[PDB]
Amino acid sequence: TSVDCTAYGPELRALAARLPRTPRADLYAFLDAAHTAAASLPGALATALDTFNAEGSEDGHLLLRGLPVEADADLPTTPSSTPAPEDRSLLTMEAMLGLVGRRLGLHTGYRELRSGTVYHDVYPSPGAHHLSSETSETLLEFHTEMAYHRLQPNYVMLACSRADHERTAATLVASVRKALPLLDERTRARLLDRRMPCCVDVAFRIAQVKPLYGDADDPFLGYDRELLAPEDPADKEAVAALSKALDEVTEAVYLEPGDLLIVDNFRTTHARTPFSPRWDGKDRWLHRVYIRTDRNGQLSGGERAGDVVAFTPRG
Ligand SMILES: N=C(N)NCCC[C@@H](C(=O)O)N1CCC1=O
Ligand SMILES: O=C(O)CCC(=O)C(=O)O
Ligand SMILES: [Fe+3]
């Protein structure tokens, strides 16, 4: 699902201006400011976000296109390391992630991942491990983010400050609502609420993940093409059928500056196709944040946007 927000550029730049200019120096205060500001988002945007937050969509994602973003010459050089300096001045796309994110829920950091930071720069790095956001020429295969984590976030948000030079990197999204009809009843039944072994991402180095769960007529999805590891042959067969159906309903988003993609991380799996970096200071640069909501299991009470949580595997 996509919406063009170009007309709201002036209003959104004004809301971004309300926020503290050094977010990381006091992230709780920054996000509280973003929460107050999210109450004044343009009506069209507030409605679109509230609707997607409550109902999801058939395609599992909401793409906000044409949000404000700096001219390329005014952006810093694309980062070459992580984590980001705490004193880094606020970037417009980060302000959008603050506003849109707080309208949806609570930004969450994960202790063992990216030093526990909340805002992650997603850029290519030479010699990247194959299972990392730093990859470029190697396809980053389908994964439901932290599917193996008990405190897995409802949304993964990606805002784009720079696309890759040739605009070949595609963010792929496959939705359980489109894939499910393609599976037979026995396969659905086998997957539903059935715990299967799942490895974890490098940062967290098992877990048990239910590939499908919840209401049988509209289940949630937990899938990872690299980490999910069924052993029983019936389980492997069912996951292979699920994998094929997800491929068959794959949709692609070519992120460009000003785009903010909201992925329903309980109903999709996502990936990124290859691109060739130039190491010239203008390489692809996205900003990633994770949002927790009241959808069950994520929050137990007293949480604030900006909190960092520890690792506990599902099981
Ligand atoms: N199939 C996979 N699990 N691929 C790795 C996903 C990217 C990775 C990263 O940020 O480098 N990550 C996502 C959460 C985490 O860690
Ligand atoms: O680069 C992208 O478009 C998505 C990256 C991603 O999914 C990840 O690093 O977890
Ligand atoms: Fe991801």
From Swiss-Prot:
Protein's pathway: Antibiotic biosynthesis; clavulanate biosynthesis; clavulanate from D-glyceraldehyde 3-phosphate and L-arginine: step 3/8; Antibiotic biosynthesis; clavulanate biosynthesis; clavulanate from D-glyceraldehyde 3-phosphate and L-arginine: step 5/8; Antibiotic biosynthesis; clavulanate biosynthesis; clavulanate from D-glyceraldehyde 3-phosphate and L-arginine: step 6/8
Pfam families tied to this protein: TauD
Residues that coordinate or bind Fe cation: 143, 145, 270
Family annotation (InterPro entries): AlphaKG_dependent_hydroxylases (IPR050411), Clavaminate_syn-like (IPR014503), Clavaminate_Synthase (IPR053503), TauD-like_sf (IPR042098), TauD/TfdA-like (IPR003819)
Residues binding 2-oxoglutarate: 284
One GO term of the biological process aspect: antibiotic biosynthetic process
Disulphide-bridged cysteine pairs: none
Homology family: Belongs to the clavaminate synthase family.
EC number per UniProt: 1.14.11.21
Stated name of the protein: Clavaminate synthase 1
Catalysed reaction equations from the record: deoxyamidinoproclavaminate + 2-oxoglutarate + O2 = amidinoproclavaminate + succinate + CO2; proclavaminate + 2-oxoglutarate + O2 = dihydroclavaminate + succinate + CO2 + H2O; dihydroclavaminate + 2-oxoglutarate + O2 = clavaminate + succinate + CO2 + H2O
CDD domains: CAS_like
Keyword annotations of the record: Antibiotic biosynthesis, Iron, Metal-binding, Oxidoreductase
Co-factor binding details: Binds 1 Fe(2+) ion per subunit.
